[PDB]
Design a protein around this ligand. Structure first.
Ligand SMILES: CC1(C)CC(=O)Nc2cc(NC(=O)c3cc(-c4ccc5nc(N)ncc5c4)ccc3F)ccc21
Ligand SMILES: [Zn+2]
Length: 212
């Protein structure tokens, strides 16, 4: 039994709540739109819920463990994740063994509370070379995907200056760093264990051109 993908109807309050959080967390990045493209709204064309019994059990077991090490607060949070491994992730779950040891904060899995930040990672670091078909980081044609996940943060460690960690600091279960661009800092939430994140919603969308 693998993963079941369930479509949510747009009139479903669940669909509406997820699209609302995605649309409303679009922020300015002072990058000129280089990484994720130029837009100020998304055309959300599909929202599917990822249902996988085995994964959920892995996740909840770990959330209990974190509860017990954090004075009964697992500190769960709904965060967005954009990357090129989404399809692999929805079928097998997050696997930290595939993590890049050279991340600003180490070999962990990264999340953000702003959908526009996550959109910058859909095609790779800094937006890589853009969509496969058009090699366009601001492609209005190709459908993108991003996950809205339940992330178990437990006790988070606030990191300012870069630190190439392999695991959460002793006594902690996640790392939160506030990175710099050309003035704006947005938080990055990092975990180092695949089971501290569950890919709740699979969002299929397109960025939209600023209207004329
Ligand atoms: C831009 C930002 C902070 C926010 C966001 O939504 N995505 C994002 C993603 C990353 N990268 C990762 O989290 C990352 C994640 C993986 C990773 C994790 C689990 C996997 N599981 C499977 N099953 N397959 C491949 C996987 C790759 C590998 C390298 C990475 F660099 C870095 C920064 C961000
Ligand atoms: Zn394209």
């Amino acid at each position: 039994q693998g993963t079941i993908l369930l479509d949510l109807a747009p009139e479903d309050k669940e669909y509406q709540s997820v699209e609302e959080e995605m649309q409303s967390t679009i922020r300015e990045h002072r990058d000129g739109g280089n990484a994720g493209g130029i837009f100020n709204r998304y055309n959300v064309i599909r929202i599917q819920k990822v249902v996988n019994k085995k994964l959920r059990e892995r996740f909840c077991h770990r959330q209990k463990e974190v509860s017990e090490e954090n004075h009964n607060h697992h500190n769960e949070r709904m965060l967005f994740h954009g990357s090129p491994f989404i399809n692999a992730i929805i079928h097998k779950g997050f696997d930290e063994r595939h993590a890049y040891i050279g991340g600003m904060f180490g070999a962990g899995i990264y999340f953000a509370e702003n959908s526009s930040k996550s959109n910058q990672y859909v095609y790779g670091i800094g937006g890589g070379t853009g969509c496969p078909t058009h090699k366009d980081r601001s492609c209005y044609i190709c459908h993108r995907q991003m996950l809205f996940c339940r992330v178990t943060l437990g006790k988070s460690f606030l990191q300012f200056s870069t630190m190439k960690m392999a695991h959460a600091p002793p006594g902690h279960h996640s790392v939160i760093g506030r990175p710099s661009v050309n003035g704006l800092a947005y938080a990055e939430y990092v975990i180092y264990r695949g089971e501290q994140a569950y890919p709740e919603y699979l969002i299929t969308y397109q960025i939209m051109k600023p209207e004329h």
